[PDB]
Design a protein around this ligand. Sequence first.
Ligand SMILES: Cc1cc2nc3c(=O)[nH]c(=O)nc-3n(C[C@H](O)[C@H](O)[C@H](O)COP(=O)(O)O)c2cc1C
Ligand SMILES: Cc1cc2nc3c(=O)[nH]c(=O)nc-3n(C[C@H](O)[C@H](O)[C@H](O)COP(=O)(O)O)c2cc1C
Ligand SMILES: [Zn+2]
Ligand SMILES: [Zn+2]
Ligand SMILES: [Zn+2]
Ligand SMILES: [Zn+2]
Ligand SMILES: [Zn+2]
Ligand SMILES: [Zn+2]
Ligand SMILES: [Zn+2]
Ligand SMILES: [Zn+2]
Lengths: 398, 398
Amino acid sequence: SQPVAITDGIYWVGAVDWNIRYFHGPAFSTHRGTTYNAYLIVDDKTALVDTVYEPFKEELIAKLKQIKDPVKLDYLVVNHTESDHAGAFPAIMELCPDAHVLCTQRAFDSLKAHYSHIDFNYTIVKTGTSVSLGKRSLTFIEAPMLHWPDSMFTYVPEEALLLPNDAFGQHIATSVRFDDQVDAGLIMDEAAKYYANILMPFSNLITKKLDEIQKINLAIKTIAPSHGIIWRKDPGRIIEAYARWAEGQGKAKAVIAYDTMWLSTEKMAHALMDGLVAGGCEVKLFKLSVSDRNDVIKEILDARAVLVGSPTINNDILPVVSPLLDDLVGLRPKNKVGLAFGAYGWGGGAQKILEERLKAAKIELIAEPGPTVQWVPRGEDLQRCYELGRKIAARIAD
Amino acid sequence: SQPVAITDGIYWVGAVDWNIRYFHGPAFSTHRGTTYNAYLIVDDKTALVDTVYEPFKEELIAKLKQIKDPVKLDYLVVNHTESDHAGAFPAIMELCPDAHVLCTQRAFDSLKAHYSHIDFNYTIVKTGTSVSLGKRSLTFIEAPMLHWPDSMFTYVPEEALLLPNDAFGQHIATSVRFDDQVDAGLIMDEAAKYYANILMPFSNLITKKLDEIQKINLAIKTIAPSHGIIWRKDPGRIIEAYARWAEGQGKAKAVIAYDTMWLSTEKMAHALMDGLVAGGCEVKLFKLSVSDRNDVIKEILDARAVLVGSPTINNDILPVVSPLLDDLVGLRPKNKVGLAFGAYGWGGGAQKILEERLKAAKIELIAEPGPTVQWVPRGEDLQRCYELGRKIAARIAD
Ligand SMILES: Cc1cc2nc3c(=O)[nH]c(=O)nc-3n(C[C@H](O)[C@H](O)[C@H](O)COP(=O)(O)O)c2cc1C
Ligand SMILES: Cc1cc2nc3c(=O)[nH]c(=O)nc-3n(C[C@H](O)[C@H](O)[C@H](O)COP(=O)(O)O)c2cc1C
Ligand SMILES: [Zn+2]
Ligand SMILES: [Zn+2]
Ligand SMILES: [Zn+2]
Ligand SMILES: [Zn+2]
Ligand SMILES: [Zn+2]
Ligand SMILES: [Zn+2]
Ligand SMILES: [Zn+2]
Ligand SMILES: [Zn+2]
């Protein structure tokens, strides 16, 4: 209910969404909810950075009024037009029709598309343009595809405060607002789940953007994302983390995702695992119909190997395995080795689909025609799987 | 615990599985459990038709012993070798090593593969062969791919009793054993869910098999499947039902499955529905992340149209939609008209994948380049969808 000061004149005025469990419709699971962060910069001219998910507009406005009641608002920065950030746009614009919109070109187009019965003063911004608010100013950095075509970061030079919007965020609901009030390991784990399921496809753009910011030699003292905790005590950790994850070097770890109807594919999954562990590799084993797809993807971010298994039903793969595959193809895991495996009763069929989808995900198969068994595995079948796991381990080496 | 008499000398000695909720691993959902039916025919020579899911072997044996204890068993018929029917094979074989196995060739192969440290006296049966037990006898009917390559039905002429194994079964747990002790509508609905998720791919084989049984002019007074209730009062209903379902004529019904992240694809789904209802069609609308895939498939059995929608995320379809698509490709719905639809933000990508998978399922698209919208639908976009639903309705005619 109460706004939170990041520093004098700069306040957090977002909303905490405790009960949300799924974001992007079904796409992302938020075991602990999330927050919609919006920032108010007070000065000779006051600016509001981003808004809030429509169902929480009241909270935004209520918090704005607690800072100054007849909400002033000279500028309204729109870093991103998804809906969790621009949903309260109409309400804000209705509250301050004179507010001046600062956004990218693609942003402006999206804004007219999603709302379009709303007129407003504006100025298309580009990397480098800067508006003054008086004592402080806000300069912009375009971030195309750093999630969306309209993405962009807002920087406040006078404070060395970066407002990346989605980048560097984590989906987690807390009544506490800063990284120094939360467990280091838990918040970094949420940050990894976030990156892995949303930013993985743009890892190359992440490094480029990190370098650009590196060259310009931007002084970042605090990072305030649009979701989750604000990195005020140690922005370096999250920046180094993004660099490591975007580089994609990985860790001597392997993730095995699979499912079975009668356990054969499972026994193969187990043999593969034993080989991988014997080869000195950490293994995470996921039976898909009982695991969370987003938690599996999070593990794959650091993995150097991805093994996916499934029996064949009606000449196709088991439907529970489909989500993970179509999700990998779209997420485009970087620098990963893989293997497909599974049982069958007569003609087979799942192995081709598995390898097809794994290659479409640009995952290099450690073996054309991966392990396959008819009905049940026998001693040598499991031995071969064990050797294969040992082979993958040798390659993931480290 | 107690065996149940179907008629003197013929007993049900299966097991009821009340707490099972997922069969075939993740594949089939059993909201109300299931049963594993096994039958004991007592005569000069006693025969046991099928066994039970391994975890319930003790129930089988306990029931056998209540009929006659030293378990006699001269013949052991194995109509099907999946594990829910042949899992207690070892235990039975160890209880009566002299038991004579009567099965198909493919069955025999499967049996040696799944067990193979178990020897037994046997005789490969073919359609028409018949063994005598004394007063009664059992004749066999091969039923390749009527689920499995090894499938076959067992017929007892003296009683006009058919023991189809999986065919005509329903996954439902009850303490009551016969169709006349259960609600006609509820049991027929379970039977439909069963057929749609398992037998749909073999509808052509179903009618051929039904005709062969028709020509031979077999007298069927009772049908005892390997799962669910025994059709003792009205086998005709279930046989007529299978005929109608296998035919695939359908009903003037349309099923719309989809999901969204921000509601645009949903608004399209709605428009399409209004057109279909206006055109005099019954509609079932399923938001996939909140519906049971097996229940959706069940509705498609009767439907003449299948509309699938999805936005595009990372140039791909939404992962929750993948299961239904890979499941339709394998199930091969017969004589269905379809359409793919969905929103997108810039490049799109889901529409291609949807149409590709829909065609792979041999579902005739009522429009290559199905309804697609960028960002949000506008008045004419919804009008167009409405017209399309109107068009499909016209074709689904009736
Ligand atoms: C409903 C059902 C459908 C099946 N369809 C096929 C099929 O089209 N092709 C095949 O080669 N095997 C098929 N099978 C056999 C399985 O692939 C085989 O039993 C395998 O051993 C099971 O693997 P799992 O123990 O890892 O679950 C099918 C089995 C079931 C129960
Ligand atoms: C994480 C995320 C990833 C996206 N990826 C793409 C993409 O690759 N291509 C595209 O054309 N649109 C993409 N979009 C935009 C959606 O397809 C678009 O917003 C659509 O309107 C959402 O449909 P809906 O309202 O039915 O959920 C993406 C949106 C989100 C939130
Ligand atoms: Zn409050
Ligand atoms: Zn509201
Ligand atoms: Zn106007
Ligand atoms: Zn082990
Ligand atoms: Zn009992
Ligand atoms: Zn047991
Ligand atoms: Zn042995
Ligand atoms: Zn309506």
